[PDB]
Amino acid sequence: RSKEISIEVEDIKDAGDTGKRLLKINTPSGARNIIIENEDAKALINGETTNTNKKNLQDLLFSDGNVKAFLQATTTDENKTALQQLLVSNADVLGLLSGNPTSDNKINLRTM
Amino acid sequence: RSKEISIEVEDIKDAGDTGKRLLKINTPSGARNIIIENEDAKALINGETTNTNKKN
Structure with a gap:
């Protein structure tokens, strides 16, 4: 059995x-x-x-949309503005990185 | 003896504690809740992450 x-x-x-x-x-x-x-x-x-x-x-894995665009290696001009702000604190340098500094930025960049 | 034999999970004498929990579980989500102890990793695998899970 x-x-x-x-x-x-x-x-x-x-x-x-x-x-x-x-x-x-x-x-x-x-x-x-x-x-x-x-x-x-x-x-x-x-x-x-x-x-x-x-x-x-x-x-x-990531909440920030500008960071996510960077990680996808595809950034819009708006994403680039935000990513510049994560990388650089000086307002006049941020003006330069935009390619379109204000009048005040231009004066300050020359001084710099 | 009738030959079908109905044996429950706890009749399996050399089954482990996690093994018996898995054998009883009905769905994949339930299985993931048993197997993955790290809450951040579990959140990723479930496709449902908070900002805290993401940072971690």
């Missing part, structure tokens, strides 16, 4: 749906496919990201 009575996964009456899928899975990749629903996060964990995955992960 046998020795072991090897039950199967579906015999475990209080196992959950994800729990049974995991118990059946053979490899770590298969387990990651069950557990991680966000496709961008799954791509990071698999070490295999497209440019779209990268942009989407950057959206999850």
